[PDB]
Symmetry: D3
Subunit: 309 residues, 6 copies
């Protein structure tokens, strides 16, 4: 699916740009924003076409509140600001964001150039609050050294987990995406043994194998993020997490980003993670990673997005 | 997608070959031609299979006059010869051709080999009247220095624009293609400032950004080739342009090739370019580009192509 | 179709791994195997996700005897063991196999790693009975020197040819696969002239162009493997052949692997090849190639495989 | 020349890491530094070997002052701190730096990982003052849109321009490198026409051709950076400049980095640029770019560097 | 050897461009040409730097007549115009050329762009007299179907073969290049059996293995092009052949281009090919290939080229 | 470098083939062998030329016994059969082989094709006694999961370590190579913690970092294979390890192959590994790895190889 915006289902890339913006209270501002994002197809092709492979993609996310400024008329069944969490040890803040631009490509320059043109076309009408330059780290690993994104759904499985279906027909082909910008305590994670780290995660480190059911801690990241309803049905998200970092500031990050046809799934995951399940039995990953952002966006289908204003 | 004839929707390639032939007068000649083109999947796979990536493709087009020689009592709704245009200084001639082979691949040798096997199969039953070896020029630029194919529709939109549908069910999935071989006057074009060149096209040169409405001349290539009907519905074509040339003869060219479900769109674009809108307000690209050919072909779907005879 | 088990329609790859296993008798053996093959997407993603390109695929086949051991309740219409053929000169043995893993990827390491993990997970519950490491040879050639896979159906035609549809709706999206490990007599092949070899195959050698009607012998590999029904409709199979071998043991091989929605098409190709058409008019390719194995498997869709 | 440190002559890469550090006044600090950099070969191979292509390289630079802390005994003929410049309009500061790590590879992750291991092995013994993540921007361009690095010397020509020869035999195979972290005024550069910009640079923008001798401004960047002595001999540097940037902070950068067997050449270039020649006739590039750092380092041959402490 | 003019020893490329030009009579023409070719590294870097890989190369040759126009003062030992050969069946014409640009790169666009810039810079001062766009054909084949360039010397042997050394120290690091544009009779070639073609060339076709001593005809292309001196030392040239052609004009070509430190080696290969060894025993390759051009050029080192 | 026999210094490859053969007793057999190996550049180019990149290489090695059959009155200074070792629990057997072909390429088919042409040329004059198809395993790891070839010397150091020099001028540019086919016990090795595995090797598993001296056991693979003489001069070998295996027979292997200008270094390494230092303090890798072969070969330079006969 080449150079079409709102392509939620794109495979992993070598490079990422994650841009979060807030819109000006102004009224021109509101409309300048709407021009840019309703015609996002323009800059996407403008940059993307310059690469033979056409690996460039761009998913636009709109915050719950800014959504009301440009379409009170109609509303996705499950749009809202990010539910903040305050558990026993660890907390997930709900930080601000009106616009999300999730940008992926085989090269940095392509990412940066798209971002540059999006930012420039918005001018004073919007301000960047968060900017992450994501990158592939070896054989699909996070900076914690684990293969990261393994159990993502694929193909038909993935469209079903991520894209709005018959259950909210006005926004079919849409999605809800939550981002969280995690920073890691490298020195603390390093005092653990590989085997302790594996227990924290749920999978072997080098080989990326899932631990047997009998050796699988009930507060391993994998168990906490497994969702099974009362009828026995699993519910999945699609995650496009990328590494990022700065050596001098000593930040080592996993940029979380998950898409689902219903954020309830992503939110239950986050609750099970921060509050724990049974309560207090939280996700040990949180001991070594602190979320610095937390934002929810609606991802309009291509039709819906081209309709704005 | 993979090694199948009449794949009209293929992404851009690094190499292409455009062959235009005229069929012999005889009944033998007509039968040989029908054999070769209805069996086109043979040569296609025979060559294409030798490349792991499977990049090779071949779209066969048939001219209006040859179509009536072979399928008298069934005819796509809009098949007619290319309609020539005569402006005051610039003209679009209508030049011979019964067959088009539009061949694309990631490598020259593949395009060439297929062309060779095709020409060999037709033997004396057809004559090449035009042959162009297309190449990608840097970051998808034409020889005028502009990124070229940017606003091509993609994915679903491409299918809607290019492929015959419910209007003409007997030929669903076919298309209509028009070629024109343009030669540029590089001297004249170089005497223009970059900014003037950008005004001719309708986009910035290096950065490939559309000029905003208020800097966008009414006779820009972009403006004149934007087609909106009374209902306010935009109509697009699919373009597979490639650069070509010969240093010794001083030929620096752009092979135009456009696909449309209805050639009325392509024709309207052409007459806006050549005759202006308002009248006299013609496309300044034509001050720098001269068409040496103009042929229209019907592109049958696979099923229809295989039935010929 | 990324990292999805039972992706029958994958394009050709640089590397592949063909694993044939016999399952143990015990009910525990039957259960371990079923647990492993039903969660096959686990290892497939555990290794496949590690490659940016996502080229890794894995198709699981199940033999007739073993299927009857896990789902006596419902059977695919055409599942039976491979049918031995015994012709005027050559024979196609029917050999054991309860499980097939047909693994493909852009790199050997990925194939090997998936195999390792699969075999480790099966433990004592199964035994590797045939193992062959296929590799692409120049411009899609086999070790006989011919471009090999040319006339595979593609896209819709491939799906129509290989995938089970309305004819057996309980097993929709599945397939039937037949494998045969062939070994060549290279010296005998080399005493033929190129033109002779071209007549055996049905296509020119370097340029991979089909011989025209009148230069085609009646017993050419191509002619014999052309299946046209009484209404004039051709019936195709999907072949993922790879080369293999061992220089020290002087083994130069072609691993035949053919998928079809109805294996009778594949079976008819085999009969016409081994017994000949008309009879005695057998495929001269068999004068240079000897199949060491012969096994038929049913390829369950994801849904059916997942619920085994 | 694979995975050897102090490989000054490596071809351009897709990715860069530029790290500048200051050493602690301490004495352990001094020796921890010396372990790390004298055995730089260790981490270089440790990371580098993990990529089949072995594109990873790392040139270690030592500041004039820290050099005296670890080798008073012997000194390169031309080592000193960066000469700051204070011209009519524009100024080049001399900022601090003891250690330079110039890291190049085909991938980001390789760069980042090497940096991460270098930083971690230094611990409290050193502090990052400057960190630039350089990237290739299209067809070897800077963010000003010009092809950047064109006239670099190559092969034998490049070894002669950059590496210390018979003229200082104790440090044969060494080099002197100057870095400057330039930030651009995008909006101002954009108010220029392409043709004005070309006049500023010395070359055509899209085509990267050098302007004719008669149309070549005497204060074009090219003329100012051309060095010809009294006998008619040209003297060149080797430059490994990379783009870098941040969208939210609105910085758009060229990271300058030049190597020479004698910094006098680089320093004359900088003087001609900032002071102008004739004086006051300075480099118009400076109107659109401000140097935020300015540092000189000695680049020890592999032998000399392995000898430290 | 990155973006350096006169890189004679570059490995094979996917694309190349062969430009032959005749210079104008005027002293201004002579000067413009000299300015352009002497600053050739300008355009070479102007386009070549734009590709990360740096695959672009450009070798400049100068004909004998034109050299005498710019440096009557000093001459390379072996520079003369190409010597026409007129044999019992075939002939090698000697055709005009003052300048050769032998351009190679991984992409056509780079070759084309370098050519464009060069030709633009020469303006009215020169005229393109032959232009051919070479391209790699499958696994290093020519349009006759044979792997083509196999026995090129490499590394030191290549430098010893191609580069001028102690024998003529004034032009050290230079070379002598001969080009001939050959066109094939494809139909005639196709009436030969593969074995017949193999005997013409001297090597097996698909597998590119040299025929042994006793199966080698005396007039095989390989045999005739083997140059052994009286001390038993072989003498090699460096050939950067590429395929080219035009389907409409039915042109299927091999562009011959051969470098040697002493062109007499190349010349002796030509005589032995066209007149045969023993005489009349000519190279049967010439029964299927006709040279449309024939030009010799001296390839100055960078230093000498830079000072022209 | 390019398609030349005896290129000992080639960088790592994705595929390799190690063939070890025994020559026939006859004078015919000895002559055929001499023809094939002195003409090795034939097959090398015949296969290697078919790949644009020219990755294919072939290093021919000759055993001590066969050397005396063919070159009685000239002999490299240190050519002798492999010296077997017998430790208390682990042994290095000495196994037959007159010829080694060590073949590397970017693709299996190339290695295979060369092997095939070589075996075909020797016909009945030689028998294969060992054949191993090497493959790269992820990011240059062996089947034990460790990055493998890290501390291999590069560039000039590699030449100094691997290639015979002024010590033995008659054979300058030759080398001595030793092969051993090791099979691992994967069960035993898996029962170890990552940290224990790291202590066995001498480097961290995932990150491939050398353990600092104070955590580095005296019997680590790294420690035991570090060779420093009385003068304090380090002695290195060049290793071209590759993974190999068969799932069905449960073979998971490491093909050791080391090149040295003097096999005394390789032998000293081996006896430190197998017999310990101090005595009994053997390499724990051997608890998990068992050598099935052990053969030493002289690698003649090109000039010497071509002279055989
Ligand atoms: C010398 C011949 C031509 C040249 C150099 C040329 C060049 C370009 C360029 C540079 C663009 C902007 C990038 C892009 O979207 O492709 C463009 C757009 C376009 N051109 Fe052409 N073109 C040529 C002929 C034609 C012809 C003959 C037609 C129609 C019959 C045509 C139709 C279009 C259309 C439909 C677009 C997209 C306009 C939009 O919706 O933004 N072009 N062309
Ligand atoms: C030693 C084993 C075999 C070899 C070396 C071999 C070789 C070839 C070659 C060179 C072709 C032509 C290129 C192509 O279209 O793939 C071909 C075609 C084909 N082969 Fe095989 N083959 C073997 C076994 C088989 C077997 C066992 C079957 C059936 C069970 C089979 C069925 C087919 C079919 C259906 C085609 C396509 C023919 C057409 O419709 O044009 N092959 N084979
Ligand atoms: C139509 C023109 C030609 C064709 C199609 C052709 C084809 C071939 C082929 C297939 C080979 C064997 C593979 C190889 O080693 O490159 C070869 C070898 C060779 N050719 Fe040509 N060639 C042509 C013209 C020439 C000319 C004009 C010369 C001399 C001026 C020449 C000199 C050589 C040499 C020196 C070899 C290497 C022979 C050896 O030592 O094994 N070729 N050619
Ligand atoms: C089962 C067999 C072997 C395995 C799995 C193995 C594995 C390794 C590993 C993982 C390393 C660290 C990375 C590197 O620098 O390569 C290493 C280093 C090394 N190994 Fe081995 N090795 C094996 C056999 C041998 C043998 C038989 C020798 C010597 C005869 C040897 C000599 C060396 C040397 C010289 C180093 C570099 C040590 C240093 O200076 O840091 N290895 N090996
Ligand atoms: Cl970015
Ligand atoms: Cl995640
Ligand atoms: Cl072509
Ligand atoms: Cl267009
Ligand atoms: Cl495998
Ligand atoms: Cl087959
Ligand atoms: Cl970095
Ligand atoms: Cl610069
Ligand atoms: Cl060209
Ligand atoms: Cl040749
Ligand atoms: Cl192999
Ligand atoms: Cl080792």
């Amino acid at each position: 699916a080449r150079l079409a915006p709102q392509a939620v289902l794109t495979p992993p890339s070598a490079a990422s740009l994650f841009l979060v913006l807030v819109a000006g209270d102004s009224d021109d501002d509101r409309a300048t924003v709407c021009d840019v994002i309703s015609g996002i197809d323009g800059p996407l092709k403008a940059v993307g076409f310059r690469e033979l492979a056409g690996s460039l993609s761009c998913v636009v996310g709109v915050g719950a509140q800014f959504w009301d400024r440009v379409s009170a008329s109609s509303k996705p069944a499950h749009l809202h600001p990010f539910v903040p969490l305050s558990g026993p040890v660890h907390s997930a803040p709900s930080t601000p964001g009106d616009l999300l631009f999730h940008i992926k490509a085989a090269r940095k320059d392509l990412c940066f150039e798209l971002g540059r043109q999006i930012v420039s076309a918005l001018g004073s009408a919007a301000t960047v609050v968060d900017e992450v330059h994501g990158f592939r780290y070896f054989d699909s690993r996070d900076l914690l050294g684990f293969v990261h994104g393994t159990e993502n759904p694929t193909d038909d499985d993935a469209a079903d987990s991520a894209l709005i279906g018959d259950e909210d027909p006005d926004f079919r082909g849409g999605s809800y995406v939550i981002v969280q910008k995690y920073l890691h305590d490298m020195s603390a994670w390093n005092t653990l043994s590989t085997e302790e780290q594996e227990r924290v995660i749920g999978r072997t480190k080098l080989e990326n194998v899932e631990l047997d059911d009998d050796a699988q801690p009930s507060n391993s990241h994998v168990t906490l993020n497994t969702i099974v309803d009362d009828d026995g049905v699993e519910h999945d998200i699609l995650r496009d997490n990328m590494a990022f970092g700065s050596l001098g500031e000593a930040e080592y990050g996993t940029y979380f980003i998950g898409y689902a046809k219903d954020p309830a799934v992503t939110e239950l995951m986050l609750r099970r993670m921060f509050l724990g399940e049974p309560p207090g039995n939280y996700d040990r990953v949180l001991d070594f990673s602190t979320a610095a952002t937390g934002t929810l966006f609606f991802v309009p289908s291509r039709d819906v997005l081209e309709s704005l204003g």
